[PDB]
């Protein structure tokens, strides 16, 4: 359906990205699905993945401290705990569910920074997803530049790595957690959850970078049957730019006609 | 456990210095390690605990950042030091301690100013 995502970009004045893949019977759909874009708060969907490799449930349990020096842009829940500190799981659950920024640095810097989270990345069979930069740094990216890039088809397949058991990087009751924190979402009922049909449960995370860039990623589940994985990521010309989530409720909208 | 800073002050521009970052206290482990600055706020550079780099593209091909993992300790090398790198620059390291107690640690700050 490359015409009505190309009707949809320049109704929105953006450019899509767009890589779905049906579990059950591997239908695709795909529109530029290997042109890179800056996948923005995205990839703490991926950090966290990459925590559970590592962590058993009960060292989520961990209590990591921190300081007002941790904080960064947007920190809704970190602000709130500098006194205390925040545990791995619920450090986790503000990264995932509220996109706090100074979380995802805190569990970054657990995990050994970016380039660790890159090599991790590497070791689950993504080539593509290019981690650089902590929070909000990793925002700034200019149309062109591969640093805190990644793609439709890579994020997909990297999700999809993590939160289904097959491929199975993570064993089950680790994929119960990020699937549930996932779900449970606060940021995205205007995006991938906008677009889908009545009565499928959504799974997402959303992001939102420069030059207009806004992004969600997300495993989906129909009534009954396999569920689907798709990002959805989109920016725009001018570096300030504004976004607007109807695009990407729309071009959701059509990947479901696709597949359906 | 405590981060202890030291190497500051000022220099011409052109030069050079370097500032220091040691962990002490009953360490465990040490993941991430490096230095901050606040013109806002940005990474400077870091270090983990395998040596990969992490460094502001600002400061890249001038800066170095190294790291002696027997020492907990951290050294940021600065050249060709601009008017525009004058800022608090201060340590983070991410640190288990034996007590198992984990966190985001903090020095103190080390000002660098860069004038003629």
């Known amino acids: 359906m490359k015409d009505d995502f190309a009707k949809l970009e320049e109704q929105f004045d953006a450019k899509l990205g767009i890589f779905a893949l049906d579990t059950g019977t591997n239908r695709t759909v795909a529109y530029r699905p290997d042109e890179r874009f800056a996948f923005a708060s995205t990839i703490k969907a991926l950090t966290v993945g990459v925590l559970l490799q590592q962590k058993s449930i009960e060292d989520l349990n961990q209590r990591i401290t921190y300081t007002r020096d941790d904080l960064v842009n947007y920190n809704p829940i970190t602000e709130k705990h500098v006194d205390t500190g925040m545990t791995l799981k619920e450090l986790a659950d503000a990264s995932l569910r509220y996109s706090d920024n100074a979380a995802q640095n805190l569990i970054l810097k657990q995990i050994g920074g970016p380039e660790s989270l890159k090599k991790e990345l590497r070791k689950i069979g993504d080539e593509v997803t290019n981690p650089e930069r902590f929070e909000p740094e990793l925002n700034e990216v200019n149309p062109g530049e591969t640093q805190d890039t990644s793609t439709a088809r890579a994020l997909v397949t990297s999700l999809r790595a993590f939160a289904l058991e097959d491929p199975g990087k993570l064993p089950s009751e680790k994929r119960e957690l990020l699937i549930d924190w996932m779900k449970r979402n606060t940021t995205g009922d205007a995006l991938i959850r906008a677009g889908v049909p009545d009565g499928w449960e959504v799974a997402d995370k959303t992001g939102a970078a420069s030059y207009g860039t806004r992004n969600d990623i997300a495993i989906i589940w129909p009534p009954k049957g396999d569920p689907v994985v798709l990002a959805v990521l989109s920016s725009r010309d001018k570096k300030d730019a504004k976004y607007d989530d109807k695009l990407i409720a729309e071009a959701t909208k059509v990947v479901m006609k696709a597949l359906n | 456990v405590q981060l202890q800073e030291s190497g500051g002050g000022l220099v011409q521009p052109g030069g050079s210095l370097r500032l220091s970052c040691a962990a002490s206290?009953?360490?465990?482990?040490?993941?991430?390690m490096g230095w901050y600055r606040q013109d806002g706020r940005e990474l400077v550079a870091l270090?983990?605990?395998?040596?990969?780099?992490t460094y502001a593209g600002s400061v890249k091909g001038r800066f170095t950042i190294s790291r002696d993992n027997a020492k907990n300790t951290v050294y940021l090398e600065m050249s060709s030091l601009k008017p525009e790198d004058t800022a608090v620059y201060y340590c983070?390291?991410?640190?288990?301690?034996?007590?198992?107690?984990?966190?985001?640690?903090w020095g103190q700050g080390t000002q660098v100013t860069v004038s003629s």
């Open positions: 983070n390291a991410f640190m288990s301690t034996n007590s198992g107690r984990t966190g985001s640690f």
């Open positions: 206290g009953s360490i465990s482990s040490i993941t991430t």
């Open positions: 270090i983990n605990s395998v040596g990969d780099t």
